Amino acid sequence: KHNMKAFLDELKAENIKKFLYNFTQIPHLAGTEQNFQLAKQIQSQWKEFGLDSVELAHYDVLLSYPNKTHPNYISIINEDGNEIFNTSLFEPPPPGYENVSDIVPPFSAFSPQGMPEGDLVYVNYARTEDFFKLERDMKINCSGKIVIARYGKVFRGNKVKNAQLAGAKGVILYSDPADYFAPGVKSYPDGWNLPGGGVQRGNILNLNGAGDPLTPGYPANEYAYRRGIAEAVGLPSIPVHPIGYYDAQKLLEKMGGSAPPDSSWRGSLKVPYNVGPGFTGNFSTQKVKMHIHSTNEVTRIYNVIGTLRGAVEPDRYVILGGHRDSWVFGGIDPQSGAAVVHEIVRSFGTLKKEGWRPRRTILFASWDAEEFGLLGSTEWAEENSRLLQERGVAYINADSSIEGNYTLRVDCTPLMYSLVHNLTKELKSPDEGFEGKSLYESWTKKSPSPEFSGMPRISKLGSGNDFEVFFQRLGIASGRARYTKNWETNGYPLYHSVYETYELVEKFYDPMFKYHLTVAQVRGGMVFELANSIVLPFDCRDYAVVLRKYADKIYSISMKHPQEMKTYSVSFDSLFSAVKNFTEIASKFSERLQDFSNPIVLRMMNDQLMFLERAFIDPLGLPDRPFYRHVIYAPSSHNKYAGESFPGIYDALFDIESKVDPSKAWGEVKRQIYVAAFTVQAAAETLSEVA
Amino acid sequence: KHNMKAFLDELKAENIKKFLYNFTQIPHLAGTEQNFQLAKQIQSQWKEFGLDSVELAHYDVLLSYPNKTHPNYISIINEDGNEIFNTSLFEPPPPGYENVSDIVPPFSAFSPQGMPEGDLVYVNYARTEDFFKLERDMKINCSGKIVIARYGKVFRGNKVKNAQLAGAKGVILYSDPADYFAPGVKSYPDGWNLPGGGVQRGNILNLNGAGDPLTPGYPANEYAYRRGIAEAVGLPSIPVHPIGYYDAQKLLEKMGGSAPPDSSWRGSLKVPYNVGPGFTGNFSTQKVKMHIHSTNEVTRIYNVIGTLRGAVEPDRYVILGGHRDSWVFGGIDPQSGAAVVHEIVRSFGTLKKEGWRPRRTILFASWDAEEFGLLGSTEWAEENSRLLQERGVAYINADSSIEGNYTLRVDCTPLMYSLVHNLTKELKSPDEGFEGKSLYESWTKKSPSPEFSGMPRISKLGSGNDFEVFFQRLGIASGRARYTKNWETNGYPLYHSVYETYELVEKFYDPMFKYHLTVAQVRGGMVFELANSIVLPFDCRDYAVVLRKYADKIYSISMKHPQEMKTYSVSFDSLFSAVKNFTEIASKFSERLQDFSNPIVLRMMNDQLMFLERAFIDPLGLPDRPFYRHVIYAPSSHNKYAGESFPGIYDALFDIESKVDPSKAWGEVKRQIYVAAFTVQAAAETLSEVA
Numbered sequence A, B: 001k002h003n004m005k006a007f008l009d010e011l012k013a014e015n016i017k018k019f020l021y022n023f024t025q026i027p028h029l030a031g032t033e034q035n036f037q038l039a040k041q042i043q044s045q046w047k048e049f050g051l052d053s054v055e056l057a058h059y060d061v062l063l064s065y066p067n068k069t070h071p072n073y074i075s076i077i078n079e080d081g082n083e084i085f086n087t088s089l090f091e092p093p094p095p096g097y098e099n100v101s102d103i104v105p106p107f108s109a110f111s112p113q114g115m116p117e118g119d120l121v122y123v124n125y126a127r128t129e130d131f132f133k134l135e136r137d138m139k140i141n142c143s144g145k146i147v148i149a150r151y152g153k154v155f156r157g158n159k160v161k162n163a164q165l166a167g168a169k170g171v172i173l174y175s176d177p178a179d180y181f182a183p184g185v186k187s188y189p190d191g192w193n194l195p196g197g198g199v200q201r202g203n204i205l206n207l208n209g210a211g212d213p214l215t216p217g218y219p220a221n222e223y224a225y226r227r228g229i230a231e232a233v234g235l236p237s238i239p240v241h242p243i244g245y246y247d248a249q250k251l252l253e254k255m256g257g258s259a260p261p262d263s264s265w266r267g268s269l270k271v272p273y274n275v276g277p278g279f280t281g282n283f284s285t286q287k288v289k290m291h292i293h294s295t296n297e298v299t300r301i302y303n304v305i306g307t308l309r310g311a312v313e314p315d316r317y318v319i320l321g322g323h324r325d326s327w328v329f330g331g332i333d334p335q336s337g338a339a340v341v342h343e344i345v346r347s348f349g350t351l352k353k354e355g356w357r358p359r360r361t362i363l364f365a366s367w368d369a370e371e372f373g374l375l376g377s378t379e380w381a382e383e384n385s386r387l388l389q390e391r392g393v394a395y396i397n398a399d400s401s402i403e404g405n406y407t408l409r410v411d412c413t414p415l416m417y418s419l420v421h422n423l424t425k426e427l428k429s430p431d432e433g434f435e436g437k438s439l440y441e442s443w444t445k446k447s448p449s450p451e452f453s454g455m456p457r458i459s460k461l462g463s464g465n466d467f468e469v470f471f472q473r474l475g476i477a478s479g480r481a482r483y484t485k486n487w488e489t490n491g492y493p494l495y496h497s498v499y500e501t502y503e504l505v506e507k508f509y510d511p512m513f514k515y516h517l518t519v520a521q522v523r524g525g526m527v528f529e530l531a532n533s534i535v536l537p538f539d540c541r542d543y544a545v546v547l548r549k550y551a552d553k554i555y556s557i558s559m560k561h562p563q564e565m566k567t568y569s570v571s572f573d574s575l576f577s578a579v580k581n582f583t584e585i586a587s588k589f590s591e592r593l594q595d596f597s598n599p600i601v602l603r604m605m606n607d608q609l610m611f612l613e614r615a616f617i618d619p620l621g622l623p624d625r626p627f628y629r630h631v632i633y634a635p636s637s638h639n640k641y642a643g644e645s646f647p648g649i650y651d652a653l654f655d656i657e658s659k660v661d662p663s664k665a666w667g668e669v670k671r672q673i674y675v676a677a678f679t680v681q682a683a684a685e686t687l688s689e690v691a
C-alpha cells in the first residue's frame, strides 16, 4: 500500500547523515558561487528523486559583506590615538578546516560604515526594559555613546533598534558565557560550547516582513524599480559589530561609572559589569573605536522550487520549505534541516515512481538568503502572492532539525494542533527510556502544556524564519518542529559561528541521526496528511480555545489600568462577544464537517478550512508594519523571534502610562479592540453556512 | 423548461411600471423614516416573492442634512451689509406635489457651516484644466475668493477639491442651460428639461473608495470606533451650495474683471461669462455672501440583502445590487433601477417556487445611502470582505435603468464583453425601426465601437455608483447597463432635482416601459448566465486585447516627453512583455477550457476564471488612495465618474512637465511601470496550469 506508513518507513537516518555531510564541507554564504553550485546540485537531485518539475527562481536583492582588504575590528585607543588593543579579525578555524577558503569573518550584516570613537555604556541584553532601567531608573544617557550589549533573549536587530533610539553612535554585540557556555561541557572541538574566540554572525535589520530592503511589496526581478539606499527598509543608522568573550572581557574589564543595578545584569565573566559610561579613573581618557567597512551590494540569489503535482486537487498547495544559505558551514543552521527536506523529497519521489501521487500538490523549496532577512522566501512569495492567497493550504518550515537532544519543539497555528497530537501518537519516541513508547508520550512528559494535563506544549509562531511571509503576511496556516534542549537545565551555543560543522552534529548532538529521523517523520508526516487527507486536517475549534486565552490575557493587561478604563470607557465586551461567536460557529461547523459522497460540499468545506487562517488577515496591516497583516499573531515589536497575540492591542497598551496624551493613547487601544473584535467575528462568519 | 428564456419571459413591463409608481410617491432620503419603511416593504416582498432569506443589514454612518429652522442661501450684499438679493430656499414643487412634506431643500451634502463673504471668480466647470487656464494662462488668483462653477463634465466633488486647492473660500455650483436644457424641449412638467428654479442636489465628498467617513476599512457596526470629524475622510473644508439658473443669472450678470478666455467657457445665459474676480465698476463694492448651516450627523441606514441559495455551488455568489435611497422622489435615480431589480427578484422567485434553483447563489441588494457616498454598499462589503474575496463571482449594478430612450449603454470589465455580446444577440430590440431585430443589432448600429466594425461600444467602469467597492477595492468582475441618450445630438437634465418623478418617466422617457423591460432583460439575463452557466461566462482573451490598447495609450502619453524618457531611461518594455505573456497564456487557457466530466478540473478552471479579476488587485493600493487597489482601472483623479486605465502610471505622468524635480517624477513613472508590468504578469500566471 501507498499510505503514510509507506512514506514514513522509507525515510532513513543513514541518508540524512550522508546528505548532511554532503551539504557542510564548504561555506554556502548567500550570493556566493558555492551556494549557486549547491542550488544546482539540489535542483538536479530533486529531478532524479522524481519530482515533476524543479526550477530555480532567482532575484537580485540587497546583501552585505565585509571588505576583504579592509577588515572590520574594534580598538581601545589612548589619548594619543594609539590603538592599544584590537579585537580579532577572524575566528580560529576548527580542526581540519584551517585551510578552508572563503570563511566570512564575523560581522553584523547591513551595518553602515563608520569609525565612531567614544565611551562605552553596557546595556545588558539591550532589551526595551534594559533601556527603560538605564534611562528612567539609573538616569544614564546613551546619547553619543558606544553601547555594548550581550547577545541573548531577543533578536539582535531589536537590540540595534533600541540602541539607535537611545541615541547610541555604535553597538558592540558579544557572546557572554552566561548565555553561550553550558556548565560542565567543553568548548568546541571537545564539546558543544562556544570558545572564547567564537563569534555569532547575523543580520541586524528591522524589516518587519518587507523582504529585500529595496523592493518592498514586489519581487526583486529583472525589471524591478529599486528604492535608493536612503529610502531602503530596515537598515541600521549606526555601525555594529559582534565579538567573542575573550575580546569582550578586554572591553568590559576597565568599565567605570555606575555599578550594575542588580544580578540580572551580570554575566559570567570576571568583570564588574559596570554600566559606565566610560572607563575607571586610571583609564578614563582611553576610548573605544569601531572600524566598520562592510558594503551593501545588490546580489543574485537562487531558490530551488520543486513540484509534485496533486492527483485530485493540483490547484491546492502544501509547501515544505527551508533555507540553504548558511553563515559558514551551516552544520546545524540550516543544513540539518535541508538534509531532512532532501530525504523527504527522496521518500515522496520513491512513492511517486511506484505510481502514487498525493491528493494535493506539494511544493518543496530550498530558499536562499534567509540569513540576510528571509529574502528568498519573501521575494518568491511576493512574486506568487496571488497563487498562494487563493491556493495555499499550508506551509511547513524546515530550518535546523536540532537545537538539542532532549525533546520535541513545535510552534504552529492552532489549526494544526490536532494534526500534531495525532501524528506524534503514531510515531516512535527516539528518546532513551521511552523505547517502545510514542513520541507523543515522551514529548508530553518532558514538555507538558502549561494549560492542560496530559498534553504537550505547542508555542505560537514567532518570526526570524522563512514561514513569516506565508503566515503573518499571507495568512497561510503554518508550522515548524525540531528537537530541542531542556529549557530548564540551561538557543544553542555554536549558533552562527564557524564551529557549527558536520562534526558538531555527528559527535555531540545526534550521532545515530535518530533525532533527525524523528524530525523528518514529524515534518514529512505533517506534509503527507495535509497533502493527502480527504478533509483538510485542521480543527477550527482549537482556534476558538486559544482566542479565548488571548482575549483573557489582553484584558488582564488592560485591567492594570482600571481608572483609565473607567475614564475612557474602554470595553472588551465586543472582543469576548466575537470569541464566543467564533466558538459557537466553529462547533456547528465541526458537526457539519463530520455529518456531511458530495465532492462539492467537501471542497466547499475544504475551502472554508483553508481560508480560515486567511480570514485573520487585515489588508491594512498593523500600525506602521504593513507586512504584518495577521490580527491574532505578529512578531513581538520588542523581539522578532517571539510571537505576540492580539499584537495591535498589545502594542497600544504597552508602556501606555508613559504616554503624554492619555486620551489619544486609550482611544487607540479602543480602536485596536474594535479591529480585533471585528476580525474575529468576520473569521467566525467564514465558517457559517455559505448561503 | 426552466432556462433563461423561462426567466426572461416572466419579466413584465407592467410590473416594472407598478413598482416604479409604488416607490416614488414620497421622498426616500437616506436616514429618514420613510426610507426605513420602504426597506421593510422590500424585505417583506422579496420574502413573498420566494427568496430563501431576506435580512436588513444596518450601519450608523455620517450623513449630512440642512437645518430645517436655519435655511441655507446665498446673497448679494452691499457696502452696508444689506442683502439685496437672495437665492431661493426651495425648488418650486411639481404639480400635485406642492403639499408633499419632507422634500429636502437643495444643498451640497457634507458642506461645512460658514458665512464667507467675498468677490466671485467664475471657473467654468472647475476642472483641473479650467484651473490651469485661470492660474497659469490668465494669471487669476482664486485665493480667498468665492468660486462659481457650472455643473457638468465631472463629478462635483472633484470641482470642490480643485476649488479648495486653488485657495477658494466657498463654492457655488449651478446648472447652466447649456448643460441641462436640450434645445427644442420644454421645462418640466411640460417636457424633460430643467426649469430655471430646478437645482441638482448631491454630495461633495472626496472619499476615494473609503465609504463612511468615520470608519475607513471597517464596517460602521454597533461597536465601531469612529474617527473624530477632524480626521474624517473626504470632507470639504469650504462651504458649498447649489443653485438654479434663474439665481445664477443674478450672480453672474454683474461679473467684471477679465473676459472668458474663449467660447468653451460660455454657457447659454444672457451674461458675458466674465471670470472676474468681482463685479463691474458700478457694483464693484457689492460682495457675495454664503450662509450654510447644514450639519453632519451619524445616522442609521439599512441595506436589504436577499439570498437565493445555489443548488450546486452555494458558496459562489453572483450579486445584483442597486440603491434605494433618493434625494427626493427618485423617479429615475434610483427607483427606475430598483423597480427593475424588484421584477427580477419576482421572476427568479417564480422559477424557484416551481422547483428551480440557480447553479450558484444569487444575492440581491437594496443599498442605502448611495447618495451620500456609496455608504451602504461599502460598509456591507467591508463587513463581508472575506466572503466576497473568496466567493464573489460577479457584481451587476442596478441604479437608474434609463437616462434617455435612444440605445443601450454598457460599462463593464472586459471579462463580460462576450457574455454581453451573446446575450444582446438573443434579446429583442425595443427600438422603433428595429422591430424584429436583436438588441445587439440596434445597439451596434446606434453606438458603434470606436475600435471594431460590427461591434458596439462598451465603456470602462468609472465610479460614482455602488459597484466601486466590489470592483476597484475587492476585484470582483462587475458591470452595469441602462438605456441612454444620443450623446451626439445633445447626464439627464432633471438629475437630482425635485422634478425627477414617476410622471417624468411615464410621460416623457418610457411610457410603455419597454426600455425598462429591455434593461431588466440585460441585467437579469447577465445574472442568470453568471449564476447558471456551467463554465463561468468570462473570456480572458478579451482582457488581453484591452490591456494592449491601454499599454499603447499610456506609452503614447509618455512619448510626448522623448527627451526625458532618454535621460531617465524610461522603458515600457516590461509592460508590453507582460501584456504579450498575458495574451499567450490566456490563449492557451482558453484552449484548455474548451478541451477539458471532471467537476474538479471544471471548478479549478471556474476558480481561475473568478480569481482573474482578483489578480489585478494590489494589496498596497494606489498612491494615497489605499481603497483603489485595481491596477488596471481606477476612477479618474480628476473626475470620479470616469474610468482611467493604468491609473498609477497615468497619474505619475499627468502634468509631469510642471514638476520641480524631474528625476524624482520620472523615477515614480518608472516605479508605476514596474508595478503595472508585474501585476499584469502575475495575473497572467494565475491562468497557467496550476502545477
Ligand SMILES: *[C@@H]1O[C@H](CO)[C@@H](O[C@@H]2O[C@H](CO)[C@@H](O[C@@H]3O[C@H](CO)[C@@H](O)[C@H](O[C@H]4O[C@H](CO)[C@@H](O)[C@H](O)[C@@H]4O)[C@@H]3O)[C@H](O)[C@H]2NC(C)=O)[C@H](O)[C@H]1NC(C)=O
Binding pocket: A574, A575, A577, A578, A581, A677, A678, A681, B222
Ligand atoms: C455575536 O453574534 C450575535 C448574534 O448571535 C451578534 O448579535 C448582534 O448584536 C448586535 C449589536 O449588539 C445587535 O444589534 C442590534 O440590532 C437591533 C436590530 O436587530 C438594533 O435595534 C439595535 O440598536 C439599538 O440598540 C442599541 C444598543 O442599545 C443602540 O445603540 C441603538 O441606538 C439602537 O437603539 C442593535 O443595533 C444585533 O441585533 C444582534 N444580532 C442578532 C441577535 O441576531 C453580535 O453582534 C456578535 N458579536 C460581534 C462582536 O459581532
Ligand SMILES: *[C@@H]1O[C@H](CO)[C@@H](O[C@@H]2O[C@H](CO)[C@@H](O[C@@H]3O[C@H](CO)[C@@H](O)[C@H](O[C@H]4O[C@H](CO)[C@@H](O)[C@H](O)[C@@H]4O)[C@@H]3O)[C@H](O)[C@H]2NC(C)=O)[C@H](O)[C@H]1NC(C)=O
Binding pocket: A222, B574, B575, B577, B578, B581, B677, B678, B681
Ligand atoms: C514574459 O514571459 C517570459 C517567459 O516566456 C519571461 O522571460 C523571462 O525573462 C527574464 C527577464 O528577462 C529572463 O531572466 C533572465 O534569466 C536568465 C537565467 O534564466 C539570467 O541569466 C538573466 O540574467 C542575465 O542577463 C540579464 C539581462 O542581460 C542581466 O541583467 C543579468 O545581470 C544576467 O547577466 C535574466 O535574469 C528569464 O530567463 C525569462 N524566462 C524564460 C525565457 O523562461 C518574461 O520575464 C515575461 N515578462 C514579464 C514582464 O514577466
Ligand SMILES: *[C@@H]1O[C@H](CO)[C@@H](O[C@@H]2O[C@H](CO)[C@@H](O[C@@H]3O[C@H](CO)[C@@H](O)[C@H](O)[C@@H]3O)[C@H](O)[C@H]2NC(C)=O)[C@H](O)[C@H]1NC(C)=O
Binding pocket: A418, A419, A422, A537, A538, A539, A594, A595
Ligand atoms: C485526531 O484523531 C481524533 C481521534 O481519532 C479524530 O477525532 C475523531 O474523528 C472522527 C472522524 O471525524 C470522529 O468520528 C465521528 O463520530 C461521529 C459521532 O460522534 C459520527 O457522526 C461520524 O460519522 C464519525 O464517526 C470521532 O468522533 C473523533 N474523535 C474524537 C473527537 O474524540 C480527529 O479528527 C483527528 N484530528 C485531525 C485528523 O485533525
Ligand SMILES: *[C@@H]1O[C@H](CO)[C@@H](O[C@@H]2O[C@H](CO)[C@@H](O[C@@H]3O[C@H](CO)[C@@H](O)[C@H](O)[C@@H]3O)[C@H](O)[C@H]2NC(C)=O)[C@H](O)[C@H]1NC(C)=O
Binding pocket: B418, B419, B422, B537, B538, B539, B594, B595
Ligand atoms: C458567445 O458565443 C460564442 C458563439 O457561440 C461562444 O463561442 C463558442 O463557444 C463554443 C463552446 O466553447 C465553441 O465550441 C467549441 O469548438 C471547439 C473546436 O474549435 C471544440 O473543441 C469544442 O468542443 C467546442 O465545440 C465555439 O468554437 C465558440 N465559437 C466561437 C469562439 O466563434 C462563446 O463561448 C460565448 N461566450 C460566452 C458564453 O461567454
Ligand SMILES: *[C@@H]1O[C@H](CO)[C@@H](O[C@@H]2O[C@H](CO)[C@@H](O)[C@H](O)[C@H]2NC(C)=O)[C@H](O)[C@H]1NC(C)=O
Binding pocket: A022, A023, A025, A040, A041, A044, A045
Ligand atoms: C555532494 O553530492 C553530490 C551528488 O552526489 C556530488 O556531486 C556529484 O559529483 C560527481 C563526482 O564529482 C559528479 O560526477 C556529479 O555530476 C555530481 N552530481 C551532481 C552535482 O548532481 C558532490 O560532489 C558532493 N559534494 C561533496 C562535498 O561531497
Ligand SMILES: *[C@@H]1O[C@H](CO)[C@@H](O[C@@H]2O[C@H](CO)[C@@H](O)[C@H](O)[C@H]2NC(C)=O)[C@H](O)[C@H]1NC(C)=O
Binding pocket: A075, A081, A082, A083, A084, A085, A086
Ligand atoms: C591595532 O591595529 C592597528 C591597525 O592595523 C595598529 O596600528 C597601526 O600600526 C601600524 C604598524 O605599526 C602603523 O603603521 C599604522 O599607522 C597603525 N594604524 C592605526 C590606524 O593606528 C595597532 O598597532 C594595533 N594594535 C595592537 C595592540 O596590535
Ligand SMILES: *[C@@H]1O[C@H](CO)[C@@H](O[C@@H]2O[C@H](CO)[C@@H](O)[C@H](O)[C@H]2NC(C)=O)[C@H](O)[C@H]1NC(C)=O
Binding pocket: B022, B023, B025, B040, B041, B044, B045
Ligand atoms: C406600495 O406597495 C405596498 C405593497 O403592496 C403597499 O404596502 C401594503 O399596504 C397595504 C394596505 O395599506 C397593507 O395592508 C400591507 O401590509 C402593505 N404591504 C407591505 C408593506 O408589504 C404600499 O401601500 C404601497 N405604497 C404606495 C405609496 O402605494
Ligand SMILES: *[C@@H]1O[C@H](CO)[C@@H](O[C@@H]2O[C@H](CO)[C@@H](O)[C@H](O)[C@H]2NC(C)=O)[C@H](O)[C@H]1NC(C)=O
Binding pocket: B075, B081, B082, B083, B084, B085, B086
Ligand atoms: C434676504 O434675506 C435676509 C435674511 O432673511 C433679509 O435680511 C433680513 O431682513 C429682516 C426683515 O427686514 C431683518 O430683520 C434682518 O435683520 C435681515 N437679516 C439679515 C441677515 O440681513 C433680506 O431682506 C433679504 N433680501 C431680499 C432682497 O429679499
Ligand SMILES: O=C(O)CC[C@H](NC(=O)N[C@@H](Cc1ccc(O)c(I)c1)C(=O)O)C(=O)O
Binding pocket: A202, A203, A333, A370, A371, A372, A373, A374, A399, A400, A403, A463, A464, A465, A491, A492, A640, A641
Ligand atoms: O532576518 C531574520 O528575520 C532572521 C534571520 C536568521 N534567522 C535565524 O537564525 N533563525 C534561527 C533563530 C533561532 C534559533 C534557535 C532558537 O531556539 C530560536 I527561539 C531562534 C531559527 O529560527 O532557527 C537570524 O535570526 O539571524
Ligand SMILES: O=C(O)CC[C@H](NC(=O)N[C@@H](Cc1ccc(O)c(I)c1)C(=O)O)C(=O)O
Binding pocket: B202, B203, B333, B370, B371, B372, B373, B374, B399, B400, B403, B463, B464, B465, B491, B492, B640, B641
Ligand atoms: O458619492 C458618489 O460616489 C456618487 C453618489 C451619486 N451617484 C450618482 O448620482 N451616480 C449617477 C451619476 C451619473 C448619472 C448619469 C450619467 O450619465 C453619469 I456618466 C453619471 C449614476 O451613476 O447613475 C452622485 O454622483 O452624486
Ligand SMILES: *[C@@H]1O[C@H](CO)[C@@H](O)[C@H](O)[C@H]1NC(C)=O
Binding pocket: A067, A068, A069, A070, A295
Ligand atoms: C575595500 O577596501 C579597499 C582597500 O582599502 C578599497 O580599495 C575598496 O574600495 C574597498 N572595496 C569596497 C568598498 O567594496
Ligand SMILES: *[C@@H]1O[C@H](CO)[C@@H](O)[C@H](O)[C@H]1NC(C)=O
Binding pocket: A141, A142, A143, A144
Ligand atoms: C542625553 O544627551 C543628549 C546629548 O547631549 C541630550 O541632547 C539629551 O537631551 C539627553 N537626554 C536626557 C533625557 O538627559
Ligand SMILES: *[C@@H]1O[C@H](CO)[C@@H](O)[C@H](O)[C@H]1NC(C)=O
Binding pocket: A192, A404, A405, A485, A508, A509
Ligand atoms: C545529549 O543528551 C545527553 C543526555 O541528557 C546530555 O548530557 C548532552 O548534553 C546532550 N547533547 C547536547 C548537545 O545537548
Ligand SMILES: *[C@@H]1O[C@H](CO)[C@@H](O)[C@H](O)[C@H]1NC(C)=O
Binding pocket: B067, B068, B069, B070, B295
Ligand atoms: C438649527 O438652527 C436652529 C435655529 O437657529 C438652532 O436652534 C439649532 O441649533 C440648529 N440645529 C442644529 C445645529 O442641528
Ligand SMILES: *[C@@H]1O[C@H](CO)[C@@H](O)[C@H](O)[C@H]1NC(C)=O
Binding pocket: B141, B142, B143, B144
Ligand atoms: C494668491 O493670493 C494669495 C493670498 O494673498 C497669495 O498668498 C498667493 O501666493 C497668491 N498666488 C499667486 C500664484 O499669485
Ligand SMILES: *[C@@H]1O[C@H](CO)[C@@H](O)[C@H](O)[C@H]1NC(C)=O
Binding pocket: B192, B404, B405, B485, B508, B509
Ligand atoms: C424619446 O425619443 C424621441 C424620438 O427620438 C425623442 O425625440 C425624445 O427626445 C426622447 N425622450 C427623451 C426623454 O429622451
